[model samples]
Structures are given as C-alpha cells and as structure tokens.
Target: QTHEDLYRAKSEKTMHVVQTASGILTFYQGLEAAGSMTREAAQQQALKEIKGLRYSQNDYFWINDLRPVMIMHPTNPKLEGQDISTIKDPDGFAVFNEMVALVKSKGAGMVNYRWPKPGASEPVKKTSYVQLFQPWGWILGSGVYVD
Candidate 1:
C-alpha cells in the first residue's frame, strides 16, 4: 500500500488495528522465510516491503527504542527465511508475543496500555501500545510510558 494509504488506514479505528497486527505477523513470517534466502536476494525482495511500514516523524505515537528489531537466524541459510523463533532478547520477545496475542485475541486492532512511573516499584504503571499493519507481512507495534 502507498504511504498515504497507510496513514489513512491508521486513522480509522478498526482498519488501523487490523492492518497493524497483520503487519506484525507478516514481519515475523518474513523473518522466518528470510532464514533460507540469500541476504542480498532477500534484501531486494523482502526487506524492501518490510521497510515500507516504518512510522514517520509526524505519525501518531512513536517510540524510537521500542521499535521492533529483525535479526537473522544464526544457522539458517535462507536470506528471506530467518528463524524469528530464535530471538535472543527474552524481554523483547516476551513483549512482542504478548502484543501479538493481545491483537489476535482483540481482533487485530489497536490496544492501549499505561505504564507506571519510573522508580516506583509498587504496582506497575500504565502504558499504551499501538499496532499498525502494512503490506508484505509487515506489522508495527510500539509502547511508551514513564520509567
């Protein structure tokens, strides 16, 4: 989809959430596929589409650190078939899995979370997480809160 279309999609409540969740699934699937393809070939064929869903400066809620990171599977030889199940970052992977499950259970739409303030160890604060979909199996989700 065109950039304009993506922006417009995010504006609509239902469409935005579904599209965003779908994008996330696609990205994971693509990463799995990338494990088997040549890096150069995969970049030309798959990475190009994945990069299109990137949020711009003026787009709604953007957290630079929370952005998803795609990595190649250590043993996989396919360029477009990286094994996403092998993600090494436990915290990040857990968060991603939770986000995916939330969207899947909630019907592919945006869900908000509020996190607790920094240094306050008691009850966790609230935070908001938003998921956006893009073509070519790319899904983008991000969360932000104090501390």
Candidate 2:
C-alpha cells in the first residue's frame, strides 16, 4: 500500500465496521417497523441478508449471544446453533465470555483476537466491536482485520 493507500485502508475499514453494524441495527429496525416479526422470525430474517453473500473484503456482522450461541455464521455453517460459551481462543482466552462481559458492562466495546482470514488457515489479528441487542439476547459484532 502506498502512503495514501495505507491511510485510506485504515480509515475505510474503520468506517466499514460501524456502517455494517448500523446496517444490521437498521435491518432489525425494518423488521420492527413491519411489526410482524417474532424473535424466531427476526432471527431468520436477519440471516437472510448474508445467506448467499460472499465477501473478499473483511466486513460483516456476526450474531452471538450471552450464552454465546453462534446464531448465524456465513463462514462457519457447522457452528450455528451450538452453545459457544465453552469455546476459547488459541491462547485459551474465553473469547465469547469476554465479548459478553464487554457488552454487558459497557454496552459496546472492541475485542482483539486471532481468527482465520476469510478462506484461509492462519489466524490473523482481528479487532471487533460488539453491541448488545437485548430483546433477543444477541451480541451484534463486526470485525476489521488490521496490523
């Protein structure tokens, strides 16, 4: 990346995460406006957006819960519906517990961890921001890969 390109990438990725999180919130708002979506229906509808979507850029909101269930994961289909509170990072950190603690205490916060880049095996540095959606017991999060 050039000097200009480097700055722009940092700026753009920062903006993208929030924009995507806001989009998820807005999607829920739309479901709220329609006034017919129950919790299960809302969950199903929220997954609909990214169902057939693919991304080369590292951008998307993932849904997890206080119990740390992987409510929706376009990247990992197998983990969906599994209780993930028992899960830990490569270093043995209770990642989901930390995420829920941050959300519970601060409403939202950033978490730094190692995760495989899209379609790759190595765990790269990723920072994510998560916000709680209390009505349905969810933590909505988006990650930005960075140096």
Candidate 3:
C-alpha cells in the first residue's frame, strides 16, 4: 500500500479500537452506578477488571474527562438537581442534549473546546466558556475551560 493509504488504514483501526474500548468502559461504569455492586468497592473492582484491556489508558482518559453536573446554581431555581428529563429551554437544552448524546454515541468521549479568559480578545472570549445543561431536566452548569 502507498504511504497515504497506510496512514489512513492505521488511523481507522486506531479509531475503531478506541470506540470499542470506550463502550466497554461505559457499560461497566453504568453497571457499577446502578448499584448492582457495592459503590465503595465496585470502583476498585472495575478498575482492576479493566486493567487487562489493551486500551485501558484511553478508556480511563475519557471517563476522567466527563465531569458530572449533579446540581444547578441556587440563583437558577428552575434547574436545581434536575435530571436529564425536565429541561425546557429549546436552544439551550438542545445543545446540552447534543453534547451528552455525542459522548454516549462516541463511546463516552469528549472533544475539548476551550474558551478564552474573561477580558481576553473577542475571538478567545467567544469560544472559551464551557456550558452544560440537562435535557432530561432543567439543570445547568458553566465554567471557564482552562488548560
């Protein structure tokens, strides 16, 4: 095969492996969260069980990156402790649902989109803020993405 063809093939293979590994990790985590196993011990058990996998590092990386937003700000009483079922804002909730679905669909991975610091250039400020919402519920969390 030509050099370009070889590169494409390798990239495709790597992507497939990463996705599959992510699926397995996500499923395992869900099981633990469901309380089928003891929450305290299950984490350690799951980690040990997944340690043998070839893509364990990648799987861990994705899981680590997904920060769960459990509660909403007090100022926004409409969103406190809401799950993914009660969100009402059309545009805002849609974007939030899309990101959540993307993570699940992509096998529990996230694409980091950083925003600029406050008072920074317009271009930087435009893309630097991180916003999250729950489609199942009217919950929101936001912060600045920092490297």
Candidate 4:
C-alpha cells in the first residue's frame, strides 16, 4: 500500500477503537444511573458486556483500573485480577504503566506497544485507544494491530 493509504488505514482503525471504548463506557454509565443494581453489580455487568465485544474476527476490548491491574481480558483470563504494572511490550517498556499515565495526564489517548495477535506466538506492533471511565476508575481500551 502507499504511505497515504497506510496512514488512512491506521487513522480509521484508531477511530473505530476509540468510539467503541466510549460506547462501552456510556453503557456502563447507563447501568449505574438506572439504580436497579449496586455500583459493583453495574460494574460486573459492564465488564461482562465489554468482554463479549468483538469488532473484527480477533480484535476485542479490555479493561484495567488506575492501579494498572487487569480487570478483564477476553483472550487471557489469567490476567484478570492480576497486577499488570510490569507487563511490557517487546521493546521492554511497561505498556500498562504508560497507558495509566497517559489517561491520568490527558484523560484518554493512544498507546503504542507490541502485543501478539490472537492465536499468535510472537509480538507485533499495536496501538490501543484507551479512555478513563472516571465513575468507576476503569480504563477501557481496544486496539488495532499494525501489520
């Protein structure tokens, strides 16, 4: 592809991920505002809904808190409830740390790192759009792989 085409693809993908993350946060807010359930219950329901989201065949959304602990990961459930402060990209930079920092500093933005695509064994470049869901202190994110 031409350089312009590649940039266009990345821009579109970034927008898609960012919009999806915001939609999920809105849904969670709706649940909380409904008052039919406790805030924790609303959070659990939101997490379930977020976990079930799939944009492309393999692309999905994930969540973590301000502590940088994994709240939910569709592909890697083992990470749930685990501290992720040390999780690093292939470049050895702590990805989750950077994500939290970016969100705290500017409320939301993209984080570039390396992560394996679904069913893959090696890492590839990835750019995730993350936003802070302030009410619950959760950082909602979704990403696009760079090929």
Candidate with top TM-score is: 4
lDDT of 3 by residue, 1-147 (tens): 699887556445445554444454455556666877654355445434433444422221112222333232222334333453333232333334544555545433223333333334332211111222122221112222332
Q: What lDDT would candidate 4 get against the real structure?
A: 0.83
Provide the clashing-pair count of each candidate structure: 34, 0, 10, 0
Better TM-score candidate (3, 4): 4
RMSD of 1: 11.4
lDDT of 2 by residue, 1-147 (tens): 599887656556544555565565567657866886765676677767744443347465677888888887766667889988887768777878899988889887668777777677677778776777766777877777774
Ranking by lDDT: 4, 2, 1, 3
- lDDT agreement with native, every candidate: 0.39, 0.71, 0.36, 0.83
Best by lDDT: 4
Ranking 2 against 3 by TM-score, winner? 2
Query: For candidate 4, what is the TM-score?
Result: 0.86
Tell me the spans in candidate 1 whose CA falls farther than 4 Å from its real position.
1-44, 52-94, 113-147
What is the descending TM-score order? 4, 2, 3, 1
- The TM-score, computed over Cα atoms with residue i paired to residue i, of candidate 2 is 0.76
Per-candidate RMSD, Å: 11.4, 4.4, 11.1, 2.7
Model 1 Cα lDDT, one tens digit per residue, 1-147? 799888455447434433563453555557656686544464344434433443432122221111333322111223234323333232343443445565456634444443223333343332344453332223343333333
What's the CA error at residue 1 for candidate 4, in Å?
17
